[PDB]
Design a protein that fits this description.
The structure is a homodimer of 66-residue chains. Chain A is of the alpha+beta class and 66 residues long. Chain A has one domain. Helix content of chain A is 27%, strand content 52%. Chain A has two helices and four strands, in the order ββββαα. The first copy, chain A, has a four-stranded antiparallel β-sheet with strand order 1-2-3-4. In chain A, a hairpin with a 2-residue loop joins strand 2 and strand 3. The longest helix of chain A is centred in the C-terminal third of the chain and has 9 residues. The PDB classes it as transcription.
Amino acid sequence: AMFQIGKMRYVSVRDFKGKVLIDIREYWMDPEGEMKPGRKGISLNPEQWSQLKEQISDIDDAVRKL
Amino acid sequence: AMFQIGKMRYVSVRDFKGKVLIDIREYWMDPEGEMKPGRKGISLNPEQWSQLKEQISDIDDAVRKL
């Protein structure tokens, strides 16, 4: 299901049309209090997700240099 | 700089308006072969990024059982 990374921001793991997706995304809250996906986000497949993970060290380095 | 996680997909680390952004995003290629940012992406601040990292194990567990 869902993994929160900020107010109104979630990583979601779902099966969509047979295929697994790691989705990093902004959400709105509707009037019934339900979270609904906003248009600012990205769906990654597991290989892309893997590549992201593999580069965390490099990403962190760049972030630290600021 | 930039970090590739698939065809047409890059994580970008930049300083924007005083603050650091880890930006995970889809790119188009223009006719001169240059990559340009598409609208499907998300800019994460370091706190959000931290929360993402903290939950990698849990995200992976979700993905694995699928």
